[model samples]
Target: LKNAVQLICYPDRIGNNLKDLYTVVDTHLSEAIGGLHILPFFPSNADGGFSPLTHKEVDPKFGTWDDIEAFTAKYDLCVDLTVNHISDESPEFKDFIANGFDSEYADLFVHVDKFGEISPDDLALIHIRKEKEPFREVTLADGTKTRVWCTFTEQQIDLNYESPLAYQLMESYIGFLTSKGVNLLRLDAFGYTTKRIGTSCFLVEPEVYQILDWINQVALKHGAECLPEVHDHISYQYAISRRNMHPYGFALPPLLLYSLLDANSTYLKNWLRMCPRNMVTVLDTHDGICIPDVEGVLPDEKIKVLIDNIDARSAANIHSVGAIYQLTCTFYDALMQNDDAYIAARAIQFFTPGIPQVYYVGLLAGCNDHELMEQTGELRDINRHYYTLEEVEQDIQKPVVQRLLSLMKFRSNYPAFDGHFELNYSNNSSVAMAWRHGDYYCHLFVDLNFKTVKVTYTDVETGETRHLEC
Candidate 1:
């Protein structure tokens, strides 16, 4: 987090040399925490310092590749590759400019019209290129003739994926990485693998699918799990027609683009109904706004606003204001209680008919701090300063962690909850219920409310009355 200049220079050196980086991660986290998804380890121009000059190396300030391998071997860990975008100051791009289309790496970029007569001041001019070229000519900010590739930013050049060499280069890197005991490879910025002349260059590209399919095949062949960091905007149904709509309709009408709070049990149920049963369901992520934080505001407000914007409501059927007060009283208690909430959330995650990923911070009940907000595209408060653990006077750990552990334990012990279960909702208030069993299983009840909630189980074999305390 310090020394930006050194971090940029000799970017390949940091991950190899840094010993403490491994120490801290191994010490604080569990062995189950598989891979290290280092945020943009490559050199970048700006925007979280993303003008990546190199792709296959670690940032200099972090250490070196040797350090990374040592750390990986010392403690089982994986690396997420941020392959897209090279830093503008990279020698490869510089040489491309000096040599023009004649450079050996000339096919690595897209050379568009440089006269500024075709698409003047249009930020996307660099995106247009010949299908066969690896590199292209670009007019730099300094008016120097430099050839660059187009990815997301002018400074960060995208690799020419159309080139078979580029594809092989990526494949070989993956094979090499997996051979080194890297268990998983997360491909970052995977959606924009290819570009078109007229499109917004987001997720709707055929090249993206092809690239992923190829990468997945390669990674699988190497016996490694390939997790792509994909951003999908799921359409909700509640906000569309205010009156609760049935999800069985042929057209899965999206509720609204931004109102996450509007998505209640009905929306969730319908989404589940429409979503492939084999697919996994995750409630929230770092990229999207939290739905729970939308407590107070009406549904008409900003659709994607943070949950903090909403206030607690009777419709939510909360059990205890005392529980909220207790949780809010101290950071530790709050964290723990939040953990309990996360346990419920995770239960929802696990019980649902799909794979579940638990975000580490969310499991810890981490607050929506400035750093987190920035990632979610929220503006920073000018007057606010850095927040420290000392400044936070509350205990944050709660029973949620235990609950999650119990759920995991249960799922492991019994196969019913693994992929086979029926989620049921009763007329009772404040209780969310589900039951899983083919031969033997559990009838689980979760209290969505903050306090204590009651549940009546239909499975008399396990007893009908259940009390879920939050």
Candidate 2:
């Protein structure tokens, strides 16, 4: 809400549940973050919380609506709207399964035949995250077998927006979430909502905008802004922004990795000059750093080397084997826990356009949790480690964490950031950025190869200059 940094975290990862999460945020994180993005805290069957059974109610194991209200009352709160799919165990999905075409809730899900016969080549044409078929065959009550649409895992059934009931369900979610003090509604996996035969079926042009435009109005009417969470190429980010919706600066992460690793600031500097200003910036998130989003922004060979270097620096070389092109390692491990380099990357994020969001692990400078990866059998779990209240207290006391907190607060309070931003200077091995508001100004200079950072700004209250080094 304030254009300050927001934190991305699973509701239960900080401590145990929402109540503990509240304590961590209120007591520890309030100074550094202006918003909290509580990732899918509902009753979910699989894929962590992405496969939600219901969107309205919170999982009782986490706290209730009252706990969420506490956060909304203090800070801007963000929640996910899994636009593409619902859990197979959800009531509507079960009803469709039990009664087949005769069920009153039959229109809630997408059937393979809804668009006509899907051929093998067409199936191959549809872009997918996993290396499996997108449809699932199931049995009906009358003992007939039919195919149902499931763009993700089998447990998460895709919803057909063509059905008025399905469309209304998502609309209602927007109104309800806004009523419950949500400032931002993340349209999770929205790109897959629009599908047509013999196409990629991912963010299909007019169809995608037709749905997104309507939903955005619903969210705005209820006093919340829609932030479409489409994880695609860098060009789509600009296209989404052009429609007056917030998009994640997804390309920044890989560009940043290249800049810091190769000691070259040419690409990063050029992007900073042109990246979307009304967007959200992230170094990493629950899904780890996205590498494919920067395909055109960075050279193909650079992306390959980045992947290889991350795997080499990461614990167990965990790459989350899949058709997806995202890496599953902590940004800290990606930089080998070098404080200066990590700070430089985050500095670039904050200094560039758009709001900033730091994952809980990234904020605490967490390393790859190999044990959790092995135990849970999800490679992304390497960056989703659970931290207790005691651990949070201890982490803030560390020098690196303290320096990060200092930078976060500075970004939050400074008035120059509210004004115009400029790419002051950039070259092969060095880059500089500055923000100016009349007499107020803030500047940052970084040495790409050596990880030397110098921050200078005017002390608005005292009319004096200040300097910071990392």
Candidate 3:
């Protein structure tokens, strides 16, 4: 996609569906957004559309492929592949259930008759997100029961890439997406797809690279790019970037929060200096505020302090689910609704060395949706607020929202951003970043202690120094 700003939103959450989303983008977000990453528009069984039932067809509730093609005709489109799993309710999975071992798709999923066959040590080596075991009992049509691997919720069954049939299905699904106008393919939960008997099965080294390379080759053939989505260590990002594939800059969100919370720019500056340029930087997403992203970057004590600060600022809106903790409030709410802090955070994100992605709720400076969280009992729901077209128009009138829009526009249109990025550590509490493209230059100066920011850029065409209004 373009190296400018991208918008991440659910079709229904942003508006009623794809048509409404398109209208919203055309009306209020055309200048600020260059690409659209609609979360997952396919029919799903659970996990907020992550458990996709089919890849060939759009969820009827979200409209059809024609609508998607029309929307993509305006902006680059990023669609999720959910490569690791598919909805158990999917026809393919159903066929496997009906015919059992005799089914043509039997090898598409990892199946086991007894857990005792595997050593306990091997099981312990498996890293899982859910608190429970990663297996679910399935009843075959022959009236026999067996355990199947399920990394996420039981409704989402894991795929077994060991079978060439699985690879064929993935290729077909990806090819289908490319035909439907997908500019980028996000391999959701990619790290867990390739499981080995004696390994952790999470980001397995050469095997993972091979898988990414193969997917990239397939995408290249269709003139699209593949982005593998992982949320663990920074090293994984470095490794992926080394292989020249775009990985998500998942660590920036928490690290930025820590920088703002402590008025310390040490970690943030260090990361900014070394982070991959060929990636998407996000401050918030449809998921919760990630904690593991800050793993080795911040000390354990400091990470605890950062979480405490978020809880305090967010009025205890943070929730610990399974193995990780998530701050359920919007990015704006997590900053205590301080307009200055929010603006400064956005400034840092925009000036960072990558394509910036603004989550739908974040674009509007939305607050925590406590009712949605309570009603769904899902921690991430707090940030997934649905806004009507009228609400969006009204929200754009807010000064903070307007300022954020202006920053996004500048980031999208500035010629300097197309040049080189330089990070200067002014001090412990301040950072100065500059971008230079021949004669054009843009500088962002931030003082964390005062929660203040100043952005100045040189208009090369006019030889004038202009200040960016926040």
Candidate 4:
């Protein structure tokens, strides 16, 4: 995650429209990001088409196999393998439904008595049931009854991992993709691959680990990286409003940053101590609360202090008969100077025992532009037009992006930054500090008061006073 930026490219959209794909990649993705998480591009016809109609083949709408090969030759590529389910178009799915145990695809799926139904509604919308569910129950024309497994939405059918053939096919497919010059294989919808009755069907899914292990083995053989798209320790406050946002499972236990903000340092401290060592830390991502968005909405009191002192803005106090008002016009000044929320987050991630992944949009401080709001129907009759990098210069100039790039470039020069380090803390716990390669020190100080801080540090080696302008 350190020095890595994840660029998300939807396969369905990019494959069908080369111009649109090139515009994003050349304009922003290739300009800023080092890695790509090209969303599931395998053949599919279901909800956002997460189901893989053909694992080994590229979606016809996305582009030809030649187009993909050419693209990967110049850029890093990581295809999402939606291996858990097959589209109804898949011969395997049809064969499994028809022949059951006698079919070659028998091992590919888990089937329950459709209870009495013929064609099951899209599995993407139905709740997966290992035993039975009344809603999914149906009577077939032949008076047969069965309940099939459906976990996510109505379109993505669950793959039956109970079959060893499924694992073999998946491994082979992964190998094939890597052989074709892919650098990473993003594990999509990783938590829901397996179904269980009376359970949330998350990290506890044994199939997840099994599949991950298999994939890891294959990736290692191919010299590829396995970067799982995970949801973990997400801010509950943010998740409630962002409905599509799903947290990573046990594979990645998310670090809760809000706990520190709400003054629950003990929870934050303990969670940091017990959290998994290899993690991808971020203040927020494409799916959740944006640091700039949160800062924009900070309470007036916090904004006031920043304006009064650090922002160097004029303050006025006025008293009326029944109401008194004090205005400190430092919002612009404080925002202009800089903020360290993301910097602190990055330090925690990179210096600690975890990796740090900065999303392209977040790294550039790209807010949910008006185009996105209109696209999602969040706002009505608003202008919807793409903003080029030139237009979003202000966002790129945000201190978060500048500082991130600076630190990333710095880390690149040091061998200690290359996933080999032992972390140590100084006297100040508020100052998240660590030692890389036992010599170079990385420290981050967070002043949550919305004020600009000039950190002063004493060098242990030379016993000299060093003041770094943060």
Candidate 5:
């Protein structure tokens, strides 16, 4: 939202809770980060707070609204609005379960009394993120049981936005978050918001746009912006951007990895030439490193090469499981924990045409948290490591981490980044990017053969060329 670097972290993962997060941001990250994209801090049933119980209340384990207000006073805050679903523990769902059709919230959920209405072929065609069926069984007050739509997991129940009451409820939730000083409202799982019986029920057009427009209008009323968090094909991002809404730069991560892995800038350069200006670029996040984001951008063989390179380079430290294509490892480890390659990747991300977001682990130059992954057995947990304040302070001493911080500071403060962006030259072995704003200009050159980066910029006041030390 500030056109600068933002740090993404769970409140407790960064520290113990909101209060500690405020302390860490104020003490260590104030100079480098422009904002904080705090992951869901509300009470949740599962999925690491993605399954929020209520949007109005903060989790008691974390601090209260006062702590949120305090943090927001200094840094812009991006909060999640789980537009597609709510937790089963939520009061609305509880009421639906208690009264069934008689409940005021009954229509808020998708209910089906019979499964035979849907053809087996149609059901098989439905696209789903997980292996389980997308429906959960629920009992009514009359002791009769029926199936309700549950997109992610049984604990996370999907919402029926076709219901006017449900739409109004979502609108009110947006207002609540905006009132609490949310600068960016992330529409989590938004692609699944609208569903059609015969379609994949993911990013269904016209209806999805209508839903986004309504939410964007509500956000505008409170001086906030909506960023739809859709992580599918690049066309979804292009579609959202065409409507003047920011979409996640989900394709950048794997593509960048591909470039560094194969020493090929062909795909990366072409992507940058057409990448959306109104988007957020990320190398990693709370989820696994996405592979499908590069589906159309790269040939199937090259994608397989990229994934294989990750496995070979890391000695199987980074690999995917099953047909889901979820790669479980820190971005640093996925790059084989090479300092030079890691810094070069960050430099490229900063030079790209979007606001860059650094995950907390990435900020610390983190490696794979194999212990946590083994403990929880969740594929994504490998990147979601909890850090103590001391651990963070110690990690800041690493040369790579220091260079990353310097890059972030430059990205946040440099004026040239606010201007034009262009891929001046790119080939398999080398790439050059330049940005110009009035009298100030910045250029970044990357040597894929050596995994090294050099940055040159002109000083506005003195008209002097300066080399950035890395």
Candidate 6:
């Protein structure tokens, strides 16, 4: 939102929670980061923070609303509103569990009994994220037993937007977020919101648009914006952008990998030519590298090769091995933790058209945390390493981390990025890109063959001729 760089991190990743985040942001992160997109801090039942019990309360472990307001006073603060589902431990779901047929919130969730029996053909049509049964069985306090739709995990039950109550509930959720000084709201798992029987549950066309229309309108009332976290084809990102909403540059991770590894800029250059400009770009996230986002950006063969390469080298895609579309690994490990290549990757991301966002792990140039992943038995934890205050200090001393911070400082303060973008001519050995806001211009020429980067930009400090930096 600031037209500058934003950092995405968990509330506790840097230390323990938001309190530590506040201290770190002010003491260390302020120079390199202009905005902070702290991932879900609400008390969740499962899925790290995805299965939220309520958006109304800050998870006590993460601190309080006053802490959030404090951050809002200084930075562009963005938080998530899980429009798709609520935790089974949530009050509404708990009420449904206790009151059964007498519960008002029972209709708020999808109940399979209402539809009677579903056909296997119909079930197969509902595109799934995880490899598990789509429905969870539960017995009510009123002696009724039935199956409920759980698109992701059993603890995270999908909301039935078909119920008018669902709209009412989500509207209130927006109010809660906006009241906390949140200007940007990330609609977590929004694509799975409208799950009609015959249609693929993910971003069902006109209905999905209609759902977003209402959301954007409500968000407008509170002076808020929505960035739908939909991991689908790159076209959906374009669609969200055309509708005047922010989408993640999810395709960049793999596309960059392909270009960097193969020493070919063909696919990455092609994507930049047409990719959405109003995007929150990322190279790594709390989750894994999403394959669906690069659906058409890379050929299927190319995607497979990249995944195989990651599996062989990173040893981090263990959980996402065979059928899963995502390749679970840190960007650092995916790039073999090579300092030069990693810096080059960050250079390209910064030069690209969008508000560049650096994940905390990627920011530190950290490798996969096999200890954490093994302890949790969740492969994504490989990228979700918890660093102590001392660890942060030590890692900051790393040359690669220092180099990344310098680049981030430039990205955060540079004036050229405020203007237009260009996909400059690039040949077999290199790729070129630039941004020019009047005389304030920055050009990036990357030699893919050698994985080297050269930057040429206006040196505003001296008010001199074009100077090569970075």
TM-score of each: 0.61, 0.96, 0.96, 0.63, 0.96, 0.96
Q: Please write out the lDDT profile of model 2 over residues 151-268, one tens digit for every residue.
A: 7888888998888887788888887789999999888888898878898999998789788878888888888888888877777778778877788888888798888998999888
The TM-score of candidate 2 is 0.96
Q: Please, what is the whole-model Cα lDDT of each candidate in the order they appear?
A: 0.43, 0.84, 0.83, 0.47, 0.83, 0.83
Encode model 3's per-residue lDDT on 1-470: one tens digit a residue: 67789999997887788998888888877988899898888889898789988888888888778888987898889989888999889999899999977888777888755334777888788886755778888988889987788789888999877787777888898899898888988888888988876678888878877877877788888777888888777888887787767878788877888889899998888888778758788887888766677788887888888876654526333433533355556888878898898889988998998889999888899988788778998878888878988999999999999989988988898898899998875898988989998888999999998888899999867789998645
> In terms of TM-score, how similar is model 4 to the real structure?
0.63
After superposing candidate 4 on the true structure, give the runs of residues whose Cα lies further than 4 Å from its correct spot: 1-33, 46-49, 60-77, 94-102, 114-147, 196-208, 228-256, 263-266, 286-340, 369-400, 412-414, 419-429, 450-470
Residue 135, candidate 6: alpha-carbon lDDT: 82
In model 6, what lDDT does residue 371 have? 84
Please name the candidate that would achieve the greatest lDDT relative to the true structure: 2
Worst 10 residues of 1 by lDDT: 1-10
Show pairs that collide, candidate 6: none
- Model 4: per-residue Cα lDDT over 1-470, one tens digit each: 23444355455432244334655556544534555555556666764446777778776666666666665675666667665666656777666556645567755666655223423443333333232442223233344564456554444556666678777777877878888778766566555665544444554445566666676667778866665554433332123113221122221112223422332233334444544433444433333321222232333453333334432322122322212222211212112223464454444544544444454444554443444544664321111223454544566566666676665444334334443443334232253433444444444444433322233334456655565644
Weakest ten-residue segment in model 5 by summed lDDT: 313-322
